[PDB]
Structure 1
Amino acid sequence: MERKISRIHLVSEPSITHFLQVSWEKTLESGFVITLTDGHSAWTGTVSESEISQEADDMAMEKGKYVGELRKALLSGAGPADVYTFNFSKESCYFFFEKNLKDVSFRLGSFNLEKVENPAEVIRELICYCLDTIAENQAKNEHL
């Protein structure tokens, strides 16, 4: 239910960023709620089961690596192992980040996101948690 800070680097939108601040349930292999924000409009939504893996077969890659890669992309730190072009489309409210192997349009996950008005406080809390972790890590370094 917590929000994990993942600033996916939008190659298509270098100006309007997008953070996949996932608010996940107690599940990883099934549909996990992934939440997104841009700076002036957040994209929340509930991911269903047996549909997120249809695009995984569209991706035509390994399962199990799918769950771990979803966790890596959703949580902090984009995974070097399977780099996806972070095309968080505002034109469709569908943050698709895809590894288009063999030069073909292959989709990764069915994320039903909706545009909202005021993500200001949510992004405030996001970066506040980031820098609170930074401050506690600094204090840990001091006493260490």
Structure 2
Amino acid sequence: MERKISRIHLVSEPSITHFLQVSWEKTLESGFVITLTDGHSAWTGTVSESEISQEADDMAMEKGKYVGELRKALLSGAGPADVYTFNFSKESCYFFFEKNLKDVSFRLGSFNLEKVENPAEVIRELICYCLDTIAENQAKNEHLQKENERLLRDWNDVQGRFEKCVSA
């Protein structure tokens, strides 16, 4: 099970950062669960494989590149030469993301979200995941730092002995 959190600036209110989390089972192809949270009230929704396939077919492009574009869009994988635009309407509960290009936008995709009735739980879960991840990464970093210190000491010692070996 995989999850990715990204920051976004909705064009409707371009002054507050909203946080979008995408959770998928084994790959982005199978489907995913999208949760968009603004810190007070959040919206959640589910997208199945069938919707992705239909969107790809209508878009008139191969599935691989459509999945690549989705990954580069939602999963913060954008490179330098690409600017995207996300849109959300709360009154209609509609979400859609497009790709801007020199005054030419392309409606890459569109989902529908249904509000969650207790934002506290989802906010708490997201913060919990973030804290757990930082803890685990810190553990790994400290471990490999210790390993490198040990190995460097070993290398110093062995080369020091090699000098004498060659001299003799």
Q: How many residues align?
A: 143
The structure with higher relative contact order (CA 8 Å, sep 6+) is 1
> Residues 30 and 82 from structure 1, CA distance in 2 versus in 1: closer, same or farther, beyond 3 angstroms?
farther
| Greater CA drift, 129-138 or 2-11 | 2-11
CA RMSD for the aligned pairs?
A: 3.3
Q: CA deviation at 1:80?
A: 4.7
Q: Distance in 2 between matches of 1:62 and 1:80?
A: 24
* Contact 2:98–2:106 (8 Å) recurs in 1: yes
Q: CA deviation at 1:111?
A: 0.7
Q: CA deviation at 1:19?
A: 2.3
> Residues 8 and 60 from structure 1, CA distance in 2 versus in 1: closer, same or farther, beyond 3 angstroms?
farther
* Contact 1:94–1:112 (8 Å) recurs in 2: yes
1:47 aligns to what SS in structure 2? strand
Aligned partner of 1:117 in structure 2 is: 117
Which structure dedicates a bigger proportion of its chain to strand?
A: 2
Structure 1 gap segments, 5+ residues each: none
Q: CA deviation at 1:99?
A: 0.8
Percent identity, please: 100
The structure with the larger Rg is: 2
* Contact 1:40–1:117 (8 Å) recurs in 2: no
Instruction: Compute the TM-score of the two structures, normalised by the length of structure 1.
Output: 0.69
Structure 2 gap segments, 5+ residues each: 144-168
Q: Distance in 1 between matches of 2:81 and 2:57?
A: 18
Q: CA deviation at 1:14?
A: 4.0
Deviations 1:16-53 (A, max 9, x none): 54322123244533543323222222222232555446
